[PDB]
RNA sequence: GGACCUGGCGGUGCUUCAUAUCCCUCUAGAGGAGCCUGUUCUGUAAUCGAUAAACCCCGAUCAACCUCACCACCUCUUGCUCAGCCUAUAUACCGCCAUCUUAACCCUGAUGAAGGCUACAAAGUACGUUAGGUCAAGGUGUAGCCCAUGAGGUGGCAAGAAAUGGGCUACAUUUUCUACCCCAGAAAAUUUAGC
């Protein structure tokens, strides 16, 4: 119920009326999402929400109690197929200061990982994309970190000749 | 061109703006007030308000350029100026008491006077009218003769008969020759003024 | 309107995310649109006043 | 195919340019405008 | 597939719903 | 052609649609405004079309629907204007008024309006010679000792113009933690991008990416480029500069730094010096870039 | 036959200037060596004819001691599977590319052909077409040969000379090599475009 007009007017003309206007039909309109509708919808969707643990007031406690950060991506395209090959990638980020490492273990871990560890940030980043799924890549990243810790805390024979 | 026609070239002269308002004439005042309205192009890399700026030497360096290599061209120019300065100092030290008043050691004065001694005043225009080709004398504009002096100097210094003599040394020798009205460039000016003297009769074909 | 008003005065008939950077299957969407326009114009002969709009 | 790949180991719109232009020029290809 | 497209248009044609 | 009844119906429909939009977007209909109409219509119907006219618009009807239906006589047929039969009643009435003003006076930055603007204001087509004649009369009125009323009458016919020196942006002066005043700016040359900070007081120290300029710029040409801005306004050795440049080559970087540092130095000089720097070509971005 | 009207002059010269394209002016190369090709002549019985099909495994490459094509000789055939050939046809269709074609009114001349401007103003206003290309990222039919247009074997074939057209390499002292990315040390005539 609006007299919306759309179009460049002709000389001594007017923008075309809405009835039969293809341009107004080509817009991805937001008539179905109005502030009143949005507020009503969000009032009914509150029932589905939990609460952030109030203890985690900011980041500073957030990397303290929950050190590991796992980043995973999802894609919304348009088409018949939902498959996107890039969604399998998983990125694990952990600050080495949180790992129970001594001096030798920290040295060994850092020069095992190489460029995955950033000296400025003290963060080790393992990117896993080998497996098809995302759960498999998350498991592989956790397994890699596990074996890396255990093999950094191990002193072989050649380790003697530093 | 990426500049609109509205854009006007910049005026880099630093003492022009410092002119007191009293000295400005009404035409000059009008021009200055007009310039406020106009758009001004960005001043190009090159000319600066530096007190050591010399447009003639800048043009000579640009004419020696090969492939946009301005660093090497300016290097050759400064080496030539230094070589001329050192040769003049060497000839000044070994000169008698009275001969030291007639030795110019400023390389800029030498460069300017040497180029001025090579400027031809009359040149020729290739013109074929009657099925056979004809040279005709013409008066050269000042820009044309200034260009011809530099072009002759550079072409002479790029000659191949100079084997393994580096360009700064060749150019300093040619500049010091032309400073004293000697050398092949002065001879090229004379063979143009004479071979345009042999063709005064064709001057009616202008 | 001429083609050079496609983003100035004219819009786009077909709308899909395929052509965006990173998104895939732009060619498949193009073929879908080609077949779909042909079939709409063949199924409603003389009824379509104007081109379609294919939204996804 | 796979057999060929194995023995080797042992050792944008998919349309014609013009059909692209008509769809592109008529606004039928999303997001493809003229510069 | 030019095939699957091709017969479908002509198949629907003699049924009396396409062009 | 649009009848008055059509426009009246459009007005009623527009009022109803305004109330409907206000209901839709949750605002109060009573205080709902035209800027609100534009914002709401843009949100509900997003459009990326560059032509602002092409974008969907909801306006008061009269703003689109034009009208030039000037009726010059009534039911009896008598024309309203006593100069009607000339065919140019507005123009000749204006000429008559000007002539009367000139008779009265005899008893006692800007431009002339263009021909088409006089057409629009008079709502009548006129040739070029009669516009010349009107402008001659206006100039004659200007020459005489025109009074305040006559000055206003002339000012009805003189449009305005602007300059291009006030559009020069002089950056604000900031203060660092130590209490030192400074000014920041940006410059661009080819692919090189420079960001310069000029301190009000200094000793002529320029730091390019944390490196002294004579070390960052071996080539004398670039050092001269950096010198040009201060030498032009005679402030060599009076300012400290800290600049960060990225991209391009040696000469592009030097030009970008020169532009950025001149734009920063504009804050500490007089407006006359700012204009002189503009006229010297120092405050203008060079648009010459590589072509395809 | 007399007088007049519109003309067209498929027009021709000169005078003056606007006089840009093209001139002069500026920069740059483009001759010469070595090889590969396009065309011609000569020669053979023949093809210096080709590798979704070989050498070649620095770059590239030629003939390979491969297979197909060609020349001279020969062999088999109911053969493979009611066999087999890639043989023609878009000069059969479709698809794809390309060509070409597709005003009114008002005045003046006595209401003749006809004419209509002056600004300090004097009648002027308003889709087909194609002996088209493509059988390489595509199809639907149509024809041919089947004691040979199928399958084999034995030898040969692997050119020569110019004049011109094109292309590929190295060509330096304002250079080259090392360190650095610029304050060091060692080496030694026509044209053609372009602003
Ligand atoms: Mg054909
Ligand atoms: Mg052969």
- HEC states along A117-136? EECCCCEEEEEECCCCCHHH
Element containing residue E9 per DSSP (H, E)? helix E2-15
Q: How far is CA F222 from CA C40, F228, F243, F256, in A?
A: 67, 10, 14, 11
Separation CA B57–CA A145 (nearest Å): 69
Assigned token pair, F204:
């002529």
Separation CA B14–CA C51 (nearest Å): 66
Query: Which candidate, F158, F156, F182, F159, places its Cα nearest to that of F171?
Result: F182
| Residues in C 1-56 with any Cβ partner in D closer than 8 A | 3-4, 6-7, 10-16, 18-20, 26-27, 29-31, 33-34, 37, 51
Element containing residue B134 per DSSP (H, E)? strand B133-139
Neighbours of chain D (3+ CB pairs under 8 A): C
F21-30: which pairs have CB atoms within 8 A and are 24 or more residues apart? F21/A2, F21/F58, F24/A31, F24/A34, F24/A36, F25/A34, F25/A35, F25/A36, F26/A34, F26/A35, F26/A36, F26/A39
Bridge partners of B136, per DSSP, are B125
Residues 6+ apart with CB under 8 A from A127: A89, A90, A91, A92
Residue F259: helix, strand or coil by DSSP? helix
Q: Given an 8 Å threshold on Cβ–Cβ distance, is A5 in contact with F20?
A: no
Assigned token pair, B17:
């703006």
Query: Which candidate, C20, C5, C3, places its Cα nearest to that of C56?
Result: C20
Is the CB of residue F134 less than 8 Å from the CB of residue F91?
Answer: yes
Does strand G come within 7 Å of the CB of B151?
A: yes
Residue B122: helix, strand or coil by DSSP? strand
Q: Is F48 on the interface with C (CB under 8 A)?
A: yes
| Nucleotide at minimal C1' distance from the B144 CA | G25
Separation CA A127–CA A141 (nearest Å): 7
- The single residue listed with the structure tokens 């030497």 is B57
Query: Which candidate, D34, D18, C35, places its Cα nearest to that of C54?
Result: C35
Torsion, Cα of C12, C17, C23, C26 (10° steps) = -50
Handedness of CA F60, F62, F64, F65 (dihedral sign): positive
Chain centroid to Cα B40, Å, comes to 27
Residue positions counted in chain D: 35
Assigned token pair, E17:
């719903």
Residues 6+ apart with CB under 8 A from F216: F208, F209
Angle, vertex CA F4, rays to CA F2 and CA F5, nearest 5: 100
Interface test mutation site (partner C, options F49, F50, F57, max chain C beta carbons within 10 A):
F49
Q: Given an 8 Å threshold on Cβ–Cβ distance, is E18 in contact with C43?
A: yes
Query: Which candidate, A150, A129, A133, places its Cα nearest to that of A141?
Result: A129
Separation CA F141–CA F245 (nearest Å): 60
Residue B136: helix, strand or coil by DSSP? strand
Closest partner CB to C35 (pick from E5, E18, E19): E5
Elucidation technique = cryo-EM
Torsion, Cα of B48, B54, B55, B61 (10° steps) = -100
Please tell me what resolution, in angstroms, this structure has: 2.5
Angle, vertex CA F57, rays to CA F54 and CA F59, nearest 5: 135
Assigned token pair, B22:
């009293």
Separation CA A71–CA F209 (nearest Å): 35
Q: Given an 8 Å threshold on Cβ–Cβ distance, is C11 in contact with F49?
A: yes
Element containing residue B125 per DSSP (H, E)? strand B122-128
Assigned token pair, F133:
């004649």
Residues 6+ apart with CB under 8 A from B64: B73, B76, B77, B154
Q: Is C43 on the interface with E (CB under 8 A)?
A: yes
**E strand residue ranges, chain F:** 110-112, 158-160, 174-175, 181-189, 192-199, 206-208, 211-212, 241-246
Residues 6+ apart with CB under 8 A from B77: B57, B60, B61, B64
Is the CB of residue F274 less than 8 Å from the CB of residue B68?
Answer: no
Residue F182: helix, strand or coil by DSSP? strand
| Residues in A 9-38 with any Cβ partner in F closer than 8 A | 9, 12, 14-15, 23-24, 27-31, 34-36
């Amino acid at each position: 119920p609006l007299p919306v007009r759309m179009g460049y007017p002709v000389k001594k003309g007017v923008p075309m009326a809405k009835e039969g206007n293809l341009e107004l039909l080509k817009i991805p309109n937001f008539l179905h999402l109005t502030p009143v509708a949005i507020k009503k919808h969000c009032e009914a969707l509150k029932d589905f929400c939990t609460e952030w643990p109030a203890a985690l007031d900011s980041d500073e406690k957030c990397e303290k109690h929950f050190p590991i950060e796992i980043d995973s991506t999802d894609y919304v395209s348009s088409g018949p197929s939902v498959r996107n090959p890039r969604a399998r990638v998983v990125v694990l980020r952990v600050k080495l200061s949180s790992l129970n490492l001594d001096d030798h273990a920290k040295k060994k871990l850092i020069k095992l990982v190489g460029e995955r560890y950033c000296k400025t940030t003290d963060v080790l980043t393992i990117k896993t994309d080998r497996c098809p799924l995302r759960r498999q890549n998350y498991d592989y990243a956790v397994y890699l970190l596990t074996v890396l810790y255990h093999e950094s805390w191990n002193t072989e024979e050649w380790e003697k000749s530093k | 061109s990426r500049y609109s026609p509205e854009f006007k070239d910049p005026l880099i002269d630093k003492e022009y703006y410092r002119k007191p308002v009293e000295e400005l004439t009404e035409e000059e005042k009008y021009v200055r007030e007009l310039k406020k309205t106009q758009l001004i192009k960005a001043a190009p890399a090159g000319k600066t308000s530096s007190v050591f700026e010399d447009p003639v030497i800048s043009k000579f360096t640009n004419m020696m350029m090969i492939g946009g290599n301005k660093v090497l061209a300016r290097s050759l120019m400064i080496q030539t100026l230094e070589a001329v300065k050192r040769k003049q100092f060497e000839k000044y030290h070994a000169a008698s008491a009275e001969e030291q008043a007639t030795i110019e050691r400023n390389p800029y004065t030498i460069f300017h006077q040497a180029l001025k001694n090579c400027e031809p005043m009359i040149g020729l225009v290739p013109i074929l009218k009657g099925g056979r080709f004809y040279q005709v004398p013409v008066p050269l504009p000042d820009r044309r003769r200034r260009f011809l002096a530099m072009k002759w100097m550079i072409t002479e210094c790029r000659d191949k008969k100079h084997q393994r003599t580096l360009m700064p040394e060749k150019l300093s020798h040619k500049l010091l020759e032309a400073f004293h009205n000697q050398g092949p460039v002065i001879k090229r000016k004379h063979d143009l003024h004479k071979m345009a003297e042999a063709n005064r009769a064709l001057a009616h074909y202008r | 309107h001429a083609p050079h008003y496609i983003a100035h005065r004219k819009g786009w008939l077909s709308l899909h995310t395929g052509n965006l950077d990173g998104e895939d299957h732009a060619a498949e969407r193009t073929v879908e649109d080609v077949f779909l326009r042909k079939f709409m114009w063949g199924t409603f002969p003389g009824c379509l006043a104007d081109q379609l709009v294919l939204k996804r | 195919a796979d057999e060929r790949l194995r023995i080797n180991s042992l050792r944008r719109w998919r349309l014609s340019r013009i059909v692209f232009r008509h769809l592109a020029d008529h606004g039928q290809l999303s997001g493809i405008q003229r510069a | 597939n030019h095939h699957t497209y091709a017969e479908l248009m002509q198949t629907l044609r003699f049924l009396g719903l396409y062009r | 052609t649009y009848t008055e009844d059509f426009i009246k119906k459009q007005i009623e429909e527009f009022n109803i649609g305004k109330r409907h939009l206000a209901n839709m977007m949750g605002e109060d209909p009573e205080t709902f405004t035209q800027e609100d109409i534009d914002r709401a219509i843009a949100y509900l119907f997003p459009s990326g079309l560059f032509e602002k006219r092409a974008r969907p618009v909801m306006k008061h009807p009269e703003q689109i629907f034009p009208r030039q239906r000037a009726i010059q006589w009534g039911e009896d047929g008598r024309p309203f204007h006593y100069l009607f039969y000339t065919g140019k009643q507005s123009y000749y009435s204006l000429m008559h008024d000007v002539y009367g003003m000139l008779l009265n006076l005899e008893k006692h930055g800007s431009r002339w309006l263009i021909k088409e603007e006089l057409e629009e204001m008079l709502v009548e087509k006129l040739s070029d010679l009669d516009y010349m004649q009107f402008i001659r009369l206006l100039e004659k009125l200007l020459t005489s000792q025109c009074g305040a009323a006559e000055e206003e009458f002339v000012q009805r016919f003189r449009r305005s113009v602007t300059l291009e020196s006030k559009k020069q942006l002089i950056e604000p002066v900031q203060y660092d933690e130590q209490g030192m005043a400074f000014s920041k700016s940006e410059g661009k040359r080819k692919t090189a991008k420079a960001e310069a900070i000029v301190y009000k007081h200094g000793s002529g120290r320029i730091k390019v990416n944390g490196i002294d300029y004579q070390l960052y710029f071996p080539i004398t040409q670039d050092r001269e480029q950096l010198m040009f801005p201060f030498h032009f306004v005679d402030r060599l050795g009076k300012h400290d500069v800290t600049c960060t440049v990225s991209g391009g080559g040696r000469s592009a970087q030097a030009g970008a730094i020169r532009l950025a540092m001149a734009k920063a130095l504009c804050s500490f000089v007089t407006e006359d010096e700012v204009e002189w720097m503009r006229q010297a070509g120092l405050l203008t971005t060079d648009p010459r870039v590589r072509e395809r």
